[PDB]
Amino acid sequence: SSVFQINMAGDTYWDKLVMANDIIRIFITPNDDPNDKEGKQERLIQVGMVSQVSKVGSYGNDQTQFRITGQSFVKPFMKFGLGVIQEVQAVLPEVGWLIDGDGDNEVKFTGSSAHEVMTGIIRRFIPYMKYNYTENTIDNYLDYDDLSSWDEFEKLTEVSAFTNFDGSLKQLMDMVTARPFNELFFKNSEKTPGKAQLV
């Protein structure tokens, strides 16, 4: 889990303004512009989703501040829990599906490599995770491409959706990763500044 915190001044009532789950981008200027130093790049330092805003202040010391904290796009997956539905038959009159694991909420993901499986896992749930962005969803802001793994040594896989009882997609993401043989983390996209990337 990657987490960040921001301290804000008390000039304005931020509690009524900054609604939860907003996206904040931070840019840091390393050195002087006109000097023509290599540091003049406006490199993005971190981007993530806020998940908490709180008043703070010790009036004994005569000072107050507002604090905002969030995580770098780990919030959607971690919160999205693949739950289990117990009492649904989903039958049809004198018709049925030839593949098994149908009618019920079972979903099977198959691939001969992690990049094949992980594509199917992410693509299964990412679009429908909708939000109120004025412009899109997480698929535009997260590339989740250029994935690879040991395709030659890994056979075909039948990884099940519900391997973890009512767990998060991160819990199911760990199984697909098969650590420590493959490294998974969230980091800024240097090749495409302004947006994040799942590695």
Token pair listed for 72? 């770098």
Closer to other proteins by Cβ: residue 33 or 139: 139
Between 40 and 67, whose beta carbon lies closer to other proteins? 67
* Angle of the 169-177 helix axis to the 114-125 helix axis, nearest 10: 170
Position among 23, 161, 173, 184 found at the interface with other proteins (CB under 8 A): 161
Query: Of 22-30, 38-46, 146-154, 166-174, which segment contacts other proteins by CB under 8 A?
Result: 166-174
Question: Is residue 162 near other proteins by the rule CB under 8 A?
Answer: yes
Among 166, 187, 193, 194, binds other proteins (CB under 8 A): 166
DSSP secondary structure of 63-85: EEEEEEEEESS-HHHHH-B----
Binding to other proteins (CB under 8 A): which residues in 46-85?
A: 51-60, 67, 69, 71, 75, 78-85
Q: How far apart are CA 29 and CA 27, in angstroms?
A: 7
Is 3 a binder of other proteins (CB under 8 A)? yes
Q: Indicate the residue among 105 and 182 with the shorter CB distance to other proteins.
A: 105
Least distance (Å) between residue 41 CB and other proteins: 26
CA 13 from chain centre, in angstroms, equals 29
Q: Report how far residue 137's alpha carbon sits from residue 129's, in angstroms, rounded to the nearest whole number.
A: 7
Contacting other proteins (CB under 8 A), which of 23, 24, 107, 178?
A: 107
Q: Going residue by residue from 113 to 132, which x/- string records binding to other proteins, judged by CB under 8 A?
A: ----------xxx-xxxxx-
Q: Determine, following the binding rule CB under 8 A, whether residue 182 of this chain makes contact with other proteins.
A: no
- Nearest Cα to 8, choosing from 47, 63, 62, 45? 63
193 HSE (CA, 13 A, CB side):
7
Cα gap 172→120, rounded to integer Å:
13
Among 92, 153, 180, 191, the residue binding other proteins under the rule CB under 8 A is 92
Looking only at residues 14 through 53 of this chain, which bind other proteins when binding is defined by CB under 8 A? 15, 20-21, 51-53
> Per the structure block, which two tokens stand in for 119?
């594509």
